[PDB]
Amino acid sequence: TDRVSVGNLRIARVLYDFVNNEALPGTDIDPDSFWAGVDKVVADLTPQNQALLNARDELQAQIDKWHRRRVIEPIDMDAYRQFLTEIGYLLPEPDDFTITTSGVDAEITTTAGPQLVVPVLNARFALNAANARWGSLYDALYGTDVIPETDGAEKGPTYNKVRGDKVIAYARKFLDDSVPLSSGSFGDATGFTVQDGQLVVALPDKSTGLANPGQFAGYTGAAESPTSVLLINHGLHIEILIDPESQVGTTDRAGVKDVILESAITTIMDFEDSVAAVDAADKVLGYRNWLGLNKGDLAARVLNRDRNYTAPGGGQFTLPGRSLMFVRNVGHLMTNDAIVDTDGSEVFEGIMDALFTGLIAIHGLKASDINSRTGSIYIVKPKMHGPAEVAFTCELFSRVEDVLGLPQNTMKIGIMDEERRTTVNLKACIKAAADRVVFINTGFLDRTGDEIHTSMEAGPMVRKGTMKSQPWILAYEDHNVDAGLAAGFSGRAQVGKGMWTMTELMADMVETKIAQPRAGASTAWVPSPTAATLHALHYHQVDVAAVQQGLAGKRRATIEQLLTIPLAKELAWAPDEIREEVDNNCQSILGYVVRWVDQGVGASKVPDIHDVALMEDRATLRISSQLLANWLRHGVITSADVRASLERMAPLVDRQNAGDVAYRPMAPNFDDSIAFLAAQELILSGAQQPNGYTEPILHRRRREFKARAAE
Ligand SMILES: O=C(O)c1cc2sccc2[nH]1
Ligand SMILES: [Mg+2]
Ligand SMILES: [Mg+2]
User: Fold this and answer.
1) DSSP β-bridge partners for residue 225
2) Which residues are in the CB-under-5-Å shell of ion ligand 2?
3) Residue 88 has what DSSP assignment?
4) Sign of the four-CA dihedral 77, 78, 79, 82
5) 3-class SS at 638?
6) Torsion angles phi and psi, residue 33, rounded to 5
7) 16 vs 169: CA distance, rounded Å
8) 8 A C-beta contact, residue 271 and residue 150
9) Omega before 575 cis (within 30°)?
10) Longest CA pairwise span in the chain (Å)
11) Residue 13: which of 21, 2, 5, 24 has the closest Cα?
């Protein structure tokens, strides 16, 4: 064996070395006592962890039988509801309360705007993310399909000025909508000056100020001839870079080189569904990146420093130039062999994540010879089921704080709302974290995986595409905003919404995603720094703080709508529609699995069945597999169907990775591909996985590949 014995634990050496040599130095935490903390916290909390997982299995078991004992269709929702209360699945709502969480940064309590999520195992992507707090609107507009390439404005090897002018025009118009001049348009501006503390803008036959001078917030250079001008609207910053000597500024009517938008206000470094990390070596690669981010010395190429400005009244000030970080730890399910037992039992990965990522974050609270200036650590806990599992997270963070010698309530929690048992008890869930909570958040994929698994025995479900528009999910989206607002989230915590997955479809993002801030969402997920810039446009257009005031007190969702199961209408599909959906789901699984098992990639630009590039995480494996498994259970399709579909889609996936040197085809040797067998196992063993979770099968298969590669 290759482990370091500490109490009842056998720590993997790679881990042991990393914590001692890299992580602990600077934290003034005694390496001896730290490892004692670990062995003690693990031993003390592991049974509670295991009891929760057991309880998930008990409830599901009762719901399984219940559905199998229904003669009368359609489902009596009154009985169904009372059964859930009986078995303690549906708990009574607590009285109104207001969260009490202190020491939270302004990016979270106050500022509405984009929030970026990125695989922590990718230093470059993670580097770009932390620096994505500020980004160029011009590069984003020119680089993407927001500005059409319709004849004249196509992207070429060389810079296209027809295109550049439309980019300019777009930004000129954005200025008009966001920070309006009393008279005239930014489009005709010829210069910018600052006299007596007010911003004057040069116009052809006049000059004006802002309609609200308040929106002027600073500048750089000399007041007579500024190198930039800093505007604020809706708490978000806009910078107009003025440089008549630049290529763009030369042919610009006011000498403007660019417009810079405060984009990714916060960022989530992810240890969960966007990364593949199945052993001790994978975990330390992850932890090491998190360390470099927190010490501030990650480099491939560095982390930006803050920005300097002159106050409107000729003073001096500063704005942060990094995107405030969260970290997402893994949920309650998995164990990982980075630490094993004396009998060989793996130690729970969630517990490990709280200890290590929390240890590491201490560096981010002190001068990089920097992060939460108010003294907090931000962890996003995924895949929780119900308030009891939330209280368990508190106690974990409590103990870890003691081990690390941190003040209590230092380790804040963002509660993901992505499991059905959490949704319908959301108010209780927040109350259980009332003094630590900084964040709620909804999303399609995981929540829909759980929806389908929980009602597996009820009957055939609707196609994946139909789920977005089903009653349960609309109620869920609204119910989350309400429970957040009612618990006092406005001004105190983020209410968030899900990811835009179509990375090349930015015009479409720019028209569609605006509904999220309009839905009252203080923040929402974007897959890149570019998209974070474009999504920033939405918070300039929507006054989220006002939308939230207006929603306050409304109960827009009822428990009946939440509990409305997405059953399919009897004989709803034509045989070709069934085939299209099977082929679609098998392609989604195959497309994501092959990269996961063969290459340890947890998120990437995966072409779908129609060659649209989706940037999904592992949750897309849960929904897709649970759905085919559902359809299997109820005889919507056969096993001959599933196999035939997988065998057709694998060559297709193969070609979609034609440009990848490292790629191993799955065709034609299907049963010899670990990736192919994994895709197949997820589907055929799907009904039996706890809550449809894909980690057990996936992790095992990636570890199987690692071993064949070890030869
Ligand atoms: O589809 C999603 O929910 C998703 C895609 C990516 S990439 C990093 C997180 C994340 N989440
Ligand atoms: Mg998820
Ligand atoms: Mg407004």
Assistant:
1) 222
2) 418, 446, 619
3) T
4) positive
5) coil
6) -75, -30
7) 56
8) no
9) no
10) 84
11) 2
Alpha-carbon distance of 293 to 126, in angstroms, equals: 8
Length of the chain: 711
What's the angle, vertex CA 595, arms to CA 592 and CA 599, rounded to 5? 155
Specify the amino acid at residue 157.
Answer: P
Distance, CA 179 to ligand 3 centroid (Å)?
Answer: 9
Task: Look up 105 and say whether it is catalytic.
Answer: no
**Is the distance from CB of 327 to CB of 268 less than 8 angstroms?**
yes
Site to substitute for ligand 1 among 117, 417, 450, most atoms within 8 A of C-beta: 117
How far is residue 409's CA from residue 398's CA, in Å, rounded to a whole number? Answer: 7
556 among known catalytic residues: no
Rg for the chain, CA atoms, rounded: 26
> Technique behind this structure?
X-ray
Residue for token pair 């009612």: 486
Kind and range of the H or E run holding 579: helix 575-599
Label residue 74 exposed, middle or buried (CB < 10 Å: 0-12, 13-18, 19+): exposed
What b-and-e string marks burial along 333-358, b requiring 16 or more CB atoms within 10 Å of the CB?
bbbbbbbbeeeeeebbbbbbbbbbbb
CA–CA dist 353, 475 (Å, integer): 33
Cα–Cα distance measured from residue 37 to residue 661, given in angstroms and rounded to the nearest whole number? 45
Ligand closest to CA 215: 3
CA 470 from centre of chain:
23
Structural domains of the chain, ranges and CATH numbers in brackets:
1-133+263-568 (3.20.20.360), 134-262 (no CATH), 569-711 (1.20.1220.12)
Tell me, in angstroms, the distance from the centre of ligand 3 to residue 544's CA: 9
Distance of CA 613 to the CA centre of its chain: 18
Angstrom distances, CA of residue 237 to CA of 113, 240, 425, 687: 11, 10, 37, 49
Q: Distance from the CA of 619 to the center of ligand 2, in angstroms?
A: 5
Q: Which of 272, 273, 618 to mutate to test the pocket of ligand 1 (most atoms within 8 A of CB)?
A: 273
Say which amino acid occupies 285.
Answer: L
Alpha-carbon span 298 to 71, nearest angstrom: 61
- Taking a 5 Å cut-off on Cβ, the residues next to ion ligand 3 are 543
Q: Which of the ligands is closest to the CA of residue 416?
A: 2
Catalytic residue among 436, 617, 618, 622: 617
C-alpha 108 to ligand 3 mean position (Å): 20
The single residue listed with the structure tokens 């929780």 is: 384
CA dihedral 630, 635, 639, 643 (to 10 degrees): -60
HEC-encoded secondary structure of 527-557: CCHHHHHHHHHHHHHCCHHHHHHHCCCCCCC
Query: Cα–Cα distance between 425 and 223 in angstroms, integer?
Result: 56
Checking DSSP bridges between strand 606-607 and strand 307-309, what pairing results, if any? unpaired
